[PDB]
Amino acid sequence: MQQELREAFRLYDKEGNGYISTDVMREILAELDETLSSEDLDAMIDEIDADGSGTVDFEEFMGVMTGGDE
Structure with a gap:
């Protein structure tokens, strides 16, 4: 399951990483x-x-992208 929520994030590691x-x-x-x-x-x-x-950190992305994982 490489195409988890990281699917979108990894595509934007063109400029910057993580x-x-x-x-x-x-x-x-x-x-x-x-x-x-x-x-x-x-x-x-x-x-x-x-x-x-x-910039946005990993969990910061996760929390917002999941609607509102506080």
Whole structure:
């Protein structure tokens, strides 16, 4: 089961490895949700940035991508 939730993440390890820039996660959210707009997803990314040049960590991605795994 290589195509688990990591399926999407691994595809974005083009620039960076394991710590993808928050930029890309915006597009990920747009690929996931149908109702919220780019401003909505951007605002969620706006508050998730782990400060690493604008990056998201593994579990940070996991928690948000699963809807809300707190």
